[PDB]
Amino acid sequence: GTSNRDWWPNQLDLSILHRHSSLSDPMGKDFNYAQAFEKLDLAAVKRDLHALMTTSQDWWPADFGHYGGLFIRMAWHSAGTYRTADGRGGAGEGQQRFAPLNSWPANANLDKARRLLWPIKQKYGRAISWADLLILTGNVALESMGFKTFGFAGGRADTWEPEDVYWGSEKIWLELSGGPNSRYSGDRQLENPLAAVEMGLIYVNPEGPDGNPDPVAAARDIRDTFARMAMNDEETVALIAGGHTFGKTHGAGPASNVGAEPEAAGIEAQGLGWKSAYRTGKGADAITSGLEVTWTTTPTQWSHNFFENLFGYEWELTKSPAGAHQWVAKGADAVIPDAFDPSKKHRPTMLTTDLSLRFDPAYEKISRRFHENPEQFADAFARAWFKLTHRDMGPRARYLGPEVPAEVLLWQDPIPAVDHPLIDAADAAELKAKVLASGLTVSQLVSTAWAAASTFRGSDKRGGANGARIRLAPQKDWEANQPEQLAAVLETLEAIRTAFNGAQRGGKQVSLADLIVLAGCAGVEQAAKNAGHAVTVPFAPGRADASQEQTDVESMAVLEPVADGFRNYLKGKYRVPAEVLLVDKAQLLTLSAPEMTVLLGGLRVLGANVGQSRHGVFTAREQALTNDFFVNLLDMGTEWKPTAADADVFEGRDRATGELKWTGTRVDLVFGSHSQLRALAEVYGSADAQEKFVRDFVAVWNKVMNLDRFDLA
Amino acid sequence: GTSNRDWWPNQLDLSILHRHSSLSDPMGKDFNYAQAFEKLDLAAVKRDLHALMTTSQDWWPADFGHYGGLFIRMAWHSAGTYRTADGRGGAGEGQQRFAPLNSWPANANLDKARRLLWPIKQKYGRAISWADLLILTGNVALESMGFKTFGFAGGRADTWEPEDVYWGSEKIWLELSGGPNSRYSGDRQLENPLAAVEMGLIYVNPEGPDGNPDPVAAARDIRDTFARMAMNDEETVALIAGGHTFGKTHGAGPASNVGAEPEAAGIEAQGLGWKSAYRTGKGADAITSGLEVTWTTTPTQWSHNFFENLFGYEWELTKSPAGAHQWVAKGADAVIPDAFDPSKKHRPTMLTTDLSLRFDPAYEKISRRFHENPEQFADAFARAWFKLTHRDMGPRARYLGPEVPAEVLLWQDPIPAVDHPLIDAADAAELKAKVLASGLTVSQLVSTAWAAASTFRGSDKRGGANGARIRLAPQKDWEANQPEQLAAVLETLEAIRTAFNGAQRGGKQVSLADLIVLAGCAGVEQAAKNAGHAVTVPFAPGRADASQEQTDVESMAVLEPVADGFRNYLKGKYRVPAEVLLVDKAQLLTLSAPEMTVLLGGLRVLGANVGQSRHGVFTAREQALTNDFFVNLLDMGTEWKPTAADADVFEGRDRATGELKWTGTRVDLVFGSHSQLRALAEVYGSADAQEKFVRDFVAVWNKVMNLDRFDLA
Ligand code: HEM
Ligand code: HEM
Ligand SMILES: [Cl-]
Ligand SMILES: [Cl-]
Ligand code: NA
Ligand code: NA
C-alpha cells in the first residue's frame, strides 16, 4: 500500500505531535498513576523480586542460579538510550518494551528478562508501571547480591506506543562508520543528537571502535558517548566497573545460529526473539553478544574483584567461540566459576572496553583510586546508578514512594522549598497593574516570559520557568534571550518585586520566578485589551528562585534554543529545514499541531521575535492579540517569492500592484503551504474566529507557563 | 531518519485506529458541526457562490467568463473516489484538500478551484464545512447554468488529517497495467477494493484503457469502475453526458510544461501546484489533462447538445496540442465557442470515453433514449448527481438543512419512521427476562446481536442493527451469520415479540430490530451473572424494521463480512494476513486499539465464534464474561507452535508436560505477539483487572450496538 511518506518523503510529519492520545491509552481518562503507585506495597513487590532472582525458569535458565546480572543489564539498557542533546530516550517511559528498542541488537535476550517479570507485573497491575518495574528490578538485583543502592523513586507512567525518536540514518543494524549514512564526520565527530557509535548499540562497540580491539582508542568512544548521556569520567568508570562486577556475557557458539529479532519473529514466538539453533539455544549454550567473558570470581555477589583482576593480571588478545575479540589473563589460574557446571572453572577475561579503564590515562587514575578504596567505588557507583536511572524523571516533585533519597543533587536542577504564604488573586491583580504602569511593553513582557518558560522539554522534563534560572548563567547570556534587553526587563521586575515584598506583613512574598510569569500574563492581557477584549490570563503562584550555586552551568548548555520558530530564531545554518525544527520544538513543548499553530500566530503579532524582526509579523496592530497573522497569511491577494539574497526569506507583494507588503521565513510560510497546517490556519483565519483565537491562545500560553509545575500535579 | 516502517515493513500498523483524535482537531471537544450548520444562512452562502461563478480572478481566469464547469468537475472528483467495496473515499470528509488526493494527477488545477472558495469559507467559518461547501458549489454551478438539481443535504463534518486508505500498490503515478504492482490480473480483473483503473485517476483513463483509444473497450472499464462506485448503466450515462454538457478540458501545450503537484511544490506556492511554463500558464493557455475538448455549443448553459453532437457526427481520431488521443467531428463547421477569444470557433470534439456512450451496445440504447427524451435525461442526471454526492453520508437522519429531498431513495437503505410509543425501562426488563426464559443461550444471543450490529462501517455509514436487515435477504443467508442457527434464534425472538406486542395497550410495540439488540444485551448480562458480576447493559430503543423492498439485495452484498476476526472467521484465503484484516474491520467499526482488544477477548469467551470453533476460546468457563482470554493468552507456561496441516492454526501446549491446552488462529495470537497489542492485553490480563475488563467490555458492546443510531445523535 503506497502511502503519503512514499510519494512525498520530505514532507513534514505532524503525526509526531499527536501521539499519546486518549484513543491509544487503555487506562481511563481519569487514571492517575501517581495515586496508584502511592498505594502500592513497595516492600511486597521487592520481596517478590528478591525471590525471583534465584527462581530459574527452564525456558531461560539463570546463570549461576541467579538472574541478577541479566536484570542489571536490562535496567542499564532501559536507561542507557538517553541523550542529553534532546532529552529523548532513557528509562522514564518504559520504551524498551516497544519497537524499535525491543529489537535492537544490543537488547538481545532482554526480551527474556522482561518476560520473567510478567508474573510480578500481573500480580500488582496498574499500581506499578513497566517503566518503574524495570528500574526497581535492577535495584533489587543489586541489593540481593549485597550492594547498597542510593535509593529509588517511582513515578514513571507507562506509555502505550513507540516514541518518535531520531536514532540515526543507517538502514543496516550495526553498520560500521563511514558508510553512506555515516553518523560520523571530520575527526570522528558524532552527529548530534546521537549518543551511540552505531545503530542498535547503547553507547560503544564492546570489541573496540568499528571492531578494532584497541583499549586506548575505545576509551575515546566511551568518553564521548557517556558525555552525551551526561556522565563524566568518574561516573563512567564507576558505572562500567560496577556493572561488570556482576554476571557474564553470552557467546557459546557462532552468531549465525541466532534467528530473527522480536519484531521480525513469527507469531508463535509470542513477543520473544533471537531464538538460537546452537545446542540447547539457552543457559550454558546462550548466545547474546557473541562475547564469552565472566569478569569476577563471585558473579552473584558485590565485590572489588573487577579492579583486582583488571590490574592484577596482564592481558592477551583472544577470540570467543563466536569469533569476537576479547581478552584473557594467560597464566592466571582457573579461578572463575562456570555458570552451570560445578566442576569447571575458567581464567579471568575482559572486554576491550573494560581494559579502557586501565589503559586510558585519565581513566586509570580513577580506576586506581577505586581499586585502592573500594568504599569510594561503591559510593560513586551507587550515586551514578541513581543518576543513570533517574536522569529523565524531571523535578524531585515527581519522585514517589518511601525510598526517595533526601540528598538534593546538583544534576537535578534543584528548586528550593517555599516556606511562606503565596500571593492571592488580589495581589496578582495588583502586581500586574504595577508591571503595566512601569513602562514595560507587551513585547518585552511576552518575550521575557516566553524565554523563561520555553526551555522546558517533555523528553526529560528539564527546563521551564520554575527557578528563575533565566536570570543566571548561562541562560541570561543566550543569544535567543536577547541579553541586554533581558537584563533591563529583569532590573525593572526586581524593583517591583522588592517594593511589593517590602510592603507585606506576615511572611507573604513573591518570587522572581513567579513575577516573570505573572508579568508575561499581564502583557497577554494588555494585548487582548489593545484588541478590544477583556480577558483574564490564569496564573498559579508557587515557583521559587534557584541560586547560581544550585545551577550546573555545563549541564544547562543543552537547553539553549539554537532554533526557536516561535521567536523566528535560528542561531546558524542547519542541514534540517527550519520547519522541521519548529515541529521538533513543538514536540518537546508537548504541543499538538493546533496548539503550535495558535501559539505561533499569536506570538508573531505580540512582538516575540528575536531582534524585533518583522518576519511573519503580518499585522498593522503589533502588540494587539488578534488573528491577523492568519487572515493576512491566507490572503490570496499577496504573492510570495524567495529573495535573491536569502532563499529562506520570502517577500510577499500585492499580486496586482507589486507593492511590498510583508516578509517571512519558512517557519512563517509553512502555515500556508503544508496542507494540514493550512487547514488549521484557516480555522483561526475565518471571520468568526476572533474569540476562539484569543481563548485558544490564552489556554496554550498558560499551558507553556505551567509545563514544569509538577508541584501542582 | 530510519523508522519502524523501514525496519519491519510488514508489522501491523495500529496508528490507523487512533486517527481523528482530539489532539489533531482544532475545534473544541464539544464542537457539534450539525448544530453550527443548522444556524448557517444557507441562502446567503448560495447567493455568494452564484456571484463567484462570474467573478474571474487573474491568477486563474474563468473559461467563458464562468467557473461553473470547473466547479462541477471539482464536486464530481470530491465524490468520485468512493468505492462500494469498503465505503472509503467519497465527498463526505472533504479529503480532497489533504494528501494524497489534493495532488493526484486527475485532480490537477482543482487546487485553483478550492482556493477560489477561500473567501466564502472564511466568511462563514465553522458553520459550513469544506466537505459540504465542495458539493454545494457543484450544485450552485449547475443551478447557475440552468439545471435544476434534485436537492442538497448538509452535515458532512470536516476532518483534519488524511484518511488511511489503500489506493493501490503502484509506485508511479498513472502506471499502466501489468507492472510489478499491477492492480489488474486475469481477464482485466481489477483488484478489490480498488475502483479506478490507474493510480491517481478517479475512474477511467479518458484516452482509453491503458491509453489505447478504443471506445468499446473503454466502455468495459467505465462500466466496471462505475459499478464499483455503486452506479448502474443508466446512472453512468446520465452522469457522464450530464457533466460533459458543461465546460471544457485543458491541453493547450505539452505536458512537460507542467511542474510539481501541490505536495511537491515549493513553500512559496502556498498550497498550489502544477505551475505551467506554457505561455501565460493559465486561461487560454491552461494545461490540466492534456486533452483539448469542448463538448457543446453553449458550455455555460444546460442544453441537449451533448447527445445531438455525439450521434449527429461521425468521429475521427486526432491528437490534442499535448499529444493526447481525442476525437473530432468529420466535416463539421466550427460551431463551438472559444473560451477566451470571441472571434474563434472550433469543431465539435469528444473523448474516447464519451464515444463509449454511443459504441457500447447497452450504453447506446440509453443515450438514444436520452437524446429522444431530454426530460428523462435531465431527471436521471439530477437523481444521479444527488446519489453521487450523497452516497457516503449515511442514513437520512444525518441530512441537514432546508434543501433535503423528501423522496426516499432505495440506495439510502431507508428505515421507516417510528409512529408509536417506545418501550420503557420496565418493558425492557420484562423482555430481557422473557428472552432468558426462552432457552436461548448466551452464545446464541451475543452471536446474533453481533451479526446484526457489526455490518456498520464508518467509511460510508452504511449497515448496523437498525432496520433488522439481518432477517432479510441477503444477510440472513451469509455464511458468517450461520443461517440455520440464525433462523432458529429469530423464530424465537419473533414469537416473544408477537406475544409482547399483542398484550400492549395504546399503540406501544417493540421492533424486531430493537429486540435483537435487547436480547444481545440480556445475553451479556447473563454472561456477567455467570461470572459472579452484577451488570446492567444500557439499551436505547427506537430502531425500526425495514422491508425486503426497502433493501437492495445487490448493494448489500458489499457489506458481507468475508473476514471478521471478532468471530474468528475467514471465508477463504486472502493475500492479506488475517490480523491486518482484523485491524481494517476495527477501523470500519470506529474502534480504537484498546476497544478492539477488549471486545475480541470478550467475544471469544462468550461463544461468538462462527461454528462454535474452540480457536481462541481460552477459558474453562465458556459463556461467562471474564478476562480469561488475556490471562491464558499471556501465560508463559504455554508454548505455541503452528500445526502441520495448517500454518495459520496454532497449538498451545503445557511447556513442561507437553499436554495440549488450547488452539488459536493468527487473529488470536497476534495479541500475544505484536508489542503494542500485547501491552494492551497485559492491562486486561492483570490481577486487578477483572472489573475493568467487564466495564470496558460493556461500554464497547454498547458502542457497537449504537453505531448507526443517528436518530439519537
Ligand atoms: C562501555 C560501556 C559498556 C559496554 C560496551 C558494555 C558491554 C556489555 C556486553 C557486550 C555485555 C554482554 C551481553 C551478553 O552477551 O549477554 C554486557 C553485559 C553486562 N553489562 Fe555491560 N557494558 C557497558 C556498560 C555497562 C554498565 C554501565 C552497566 C551497569 C551499570 C553494565 C552492566 C552489565 C551486566 C550486569 C551485564 C551482564 C549480563 C548478564 O549477566 O546476563 N554494563 N555488557
Ligand atoms: C468516464 C468518466 C469520465 C471521464 C474519463 C472524465 C474525464 C474528464 C477529463 C479528462 C476532463 C478534463 C480535465 C481538464 O483537462 O480540465 C473532464 C472535465 C470535466 N468533466 Fe469529466 N469525465 C468523466 C465523468 C464526469 C462526470 C461523471 C462528471 C459530472 C457529472 C464530469 C464533469 C466534468 C466537467 C464539468 C468537466 C469540465 C471542467 C472544466 O470546465 O474546467 N465528468 N472530464
Ligand atoms: Cl523517547
Ligand atoms: Cl476515505
Ligand atoms: Na527521555
Ligand atoms: Na467514505
Q: Are B249 and B291 in contact (CB under 8 A)?
A: yes
Determine the atom of ligand 1 nearest the C-alpha atom of A204. Answer: 5
Q: Are A515 and A497 in contact (CB under 8 A)?
A: yes
Q: Please state, in angstroms and rounded to a whole number, the distance separating the CA atoms of residues B520 and B516.
A: 6
Q: What DSSP line would sit under A252-281, residue for residue?
A: SS-GGGB---GGGS-GGGTT----B-STTS
Helix, strand, coil proportions of chain B in percent (round to 5)? 45, 10, 45
Q: Are A458 and A590 in contact (CB under 8 A)?
A: yes
Distances (CA, A) of A476 to A444, A489, A553, A563: 15, 12, 11, 17
Select from A267, A676, A682 the Cβ nearest to the Cβ of B670. Answer: A267
| Two domains, one topology: A168-372 and A565-688 | yes
Q: Which resolution in angstroms does this entry have?
A: 1.9
Q: What is the DSSP letter of B465?
A: S
Q: Are A563 and A459 in contact (CB under 8 A)?
A: no
What are B564's three cell numbers?
A: 471478521
B498: exposed, middle or buried (C-beta count within 10 Å: 0-12, 13-18, 19+)? exposed
User: What are the residue ranges of helices labelled H in B117-202?
Assistant: 118-124, 130-144
CA B246 to chain centre: 28
The angle that helices A352-359 and A233-243 make with each other, rounded to 10 degrees, is: 140
Q: Please state, in angstroms and rounded to a whole number, the distance separating the CA atoms of residues B288 and B586.
A: 39
Q: Please state, in angstroms and rounded to a whole number, the distance separating the CA atoms of residues A160 and A27.
A: 10
- The answer for residues whose C-beta is within 8 angstroms of residue B314's C-beta and 6 or more apart is B329, B330
Q: What DSSP line would sit under B86-102, residue for residue?
A: T---SSTT-GGGSTTGG
Residue B20: φ, ψ to 5°:
60, 40
Q: Which of the residues B122, B633, B638 would you substitute to probe the A interface, choosing the one with the greatest number of A C-beta atoms within 10 Å?
A: B122
Cβ of B505: how many Cβ atoms within 10 Å? 6
Q: Does B634 sit within 8 Å of A26, measured CB to CB?
A: no
- Residue A244 among known ligand-binding residues: yes
Catalytic residue among A66, A77, A250, A371: A77
Cβ of A234: how many Cβ atoms within 10 Å? 18
Q: Please state, in angstroms and rounded to a whole number, the distance separating the CA atoms of residues A708 and A516.
A: 15
B565-688: CATH number:
1.10.420.10
- Residue of A64, A66, A134, A249 to test ligand 1 pocket, by largest number of atoms within 8 Å of CB: A249
Cβ of A311: how many Cβ atoms within 10 Å? 14
Cβ-Cβ contacts under 8 Å, B117 against chain A: none
Residue A393 CA neighbour count, 13 Å, CB half: 25
The angle that helices A374-390 and A233-243 make with each other, rounded to 10 degrees, is: 100
In the reported structure, the alpha carbon of residue B244 is separated from the centroid of ligand 2 by a whole-number distance in angstroms of: 6
- Domain B408-564+689-713 fold: Peroxidase; domain 1 (1.10.520)
Sequence spans of domains, chain A: 1-167+373-407, 168-372, 408-564+689-713, 565-688
Q: Are A611 and A570 in contact (CB under 8 A)?
A: no
Q: Are B122 and A682 in contact (CB under 8 A)?
A: yes
What are B542's three cell numbers?
A: 427506537
Q: Could you tell me how many CB contacts below 8 A there are between chain A and chain B?
A: 236
Determine the atom of ligand 1 nearest the C-alpha atom of A76. Answer: 29
Distances (CA, A) of A260 to A267, A696, B142, B237: 12, 48, 60, 56
Residue B234 CA neighbour count, 13 Å, CB half: 11
A381 Cβ below 6 A of ligand 1: no
- The beta-strand segments (E) located in B552-693 are 563-564, 569-570, 638-642, 649-654, 660-665
Residues before each break in chain A (C–N > 2.5 Å)?
A: none
Residue (of A583, A585, A612) closest to A680 by Cα position:
A583
Q: Please state, in angstroms and rounded to a whole number, the distance separating the CA atoms of residues B628 and B604.
A: 9
Looking at domain B1-167+373-407, its CATH class is: mainly alpha
The bound ligand whose nearest atom lies closest to the alpha carbon of A90 is 5
Residue (of B530, B472, B360, B400) closest to B128 by Cα position:
B400
Location of C-alpha cell 579471568: A348
Cβ of A128: how many Cβ atoms within 10 Å? 23
Does the active-site annotation cover B77? Answer: yes
Q: What is the dihedral of CA B503, B505, B507, B513, to 10 degrees?
A: -40
Q: What is the DSSP letter of B611?
A: G
The residues that bridge with A664 in the sheet, in sequence order, are: A650
Q: Are A698 and A535 in contact (CB under 8 A)?
A: yes
Q: Are B601 and B630 in contact (CB under 8 A)?
A: yes
Q: Does A687 sit within 8 Å of B122, measured CB to CB?
A: yes
Single-letter code of the amino acid located at B485: Q
Q: Are B543 and B468 in contact (CB under 8 A)?
A: yes
Q: Does B102 sit within 8 Å of A687, measured CB to CB?
A: no
Select from A26, A679, A688 the Cβ nearest to the Cβ of B680. Answer: A26
Q: What is the DSSP letter of A506?
A: T
Q: Please state, in angstroms and rounded to a whole number, the distance separating the CA atoms of residues A310 and A212.
A: 20
Q: Please state, in angstroms and rounded to a whole number, the distance separating the CA atoms of residues A390 and A132.
A: 10
Location of C-alpha cell 477584549: A533
A658: exposed, middle or buried (C-beta count within 10 Å: 0-12, 13-18, 19+)? exposed
Q: Does B102 sit within 8 Å of A673, measured CB to CB?
A: no
- Report which secondary-structure segment, H or E, holds B243: helix B233-243
Residue A401: φ, ψ to 5°:
105, 180
Q: Are A705 and A517 in contact (CB under 8 A)?
A: yes
Q: Which of the residues A268, A650, A691 would you substitute to probe the B interface, choosing the one with the greatest number of B C-beta atoms within 10 Å?
A: A268
- Superfamily grouping for domain A168-372: Peroxidase, domain 2 (1.10.420.10)
In the reported structure, the alpha carbon of residue B300 is separated from the centroid of ligand 2 by a whole-number distance in angstroms of: 14
What are B158's three cell numbers?
A: 470536516
Q: Are B707 and B45 in contact (CB under 8 A)?
A: no
- Report which secondary-structure segment, H or E, holds A337: strand A336-337
How was this one solved? Answer: X-ray
